[PDB]
Amino acid sequence: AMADLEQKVLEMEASTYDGVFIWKISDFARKRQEAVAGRIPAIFSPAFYTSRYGYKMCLRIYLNGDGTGRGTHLSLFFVVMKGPNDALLRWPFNQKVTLMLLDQNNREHVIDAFRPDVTSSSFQRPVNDMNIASGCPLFCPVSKMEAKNSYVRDDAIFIKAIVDLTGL
C-alpha cells in the first residue's frame, strides 16, 4: 500500500468522463528508443470514459510500429477495458472513434477515425481487464513526425482521442 496508491492517484488525475482524452507522452526520445530496441514495444495510456458511468477505455501506442507498420510507422490503437458498469451498458461497443497526433503549432494535425467492427472480439463486453486493442497500425510515418516537424517539442508529444457519443 505505498506505490500502489500513487499509481491509482495518477490514473485518477488523468481520468476524463466525456469521451475526450488528451495523452501527453514525455521522455519521448527514450521511450521511442526502447521501442526501437524492442525492450518496450508498446505503452498503455491511463483510462477515460464516455460518461460518468459509461464505457471504460484507454489507448495503446507502439512508438516503432506494429504489424504492417513495424519499423516505419507509429501505431495507435483503441482499447475497451472492463468497466465497473459494463452490465448496464449495451454491447458490442459501437461508437465512432477518432484518433489524433497533435501538431504543436496547431497548423496540421495527424488524424484518422473508424466505426467499430462489431464482429471483432475487440468490441465485445470484456471478460479480461482489457480486450485486444484495435485501430491504426499505419497511423503515422515515423519520418513525418519524430524527425523534423512540430509534433515533437521539448521531448514530448500529444495524442488525442474523441469517442463519439451519438446514442449515449
Binding site: 495503446r60 504489424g67 504492417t68 490503437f77 475487440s122 485486444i132 486493442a133 497500425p137
Partner: peptide, 5 residues
Amino acid sequence: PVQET
C-alpha cells in the same frame, strides 16, 4: 479498425 499484433 485493425487489431493489434
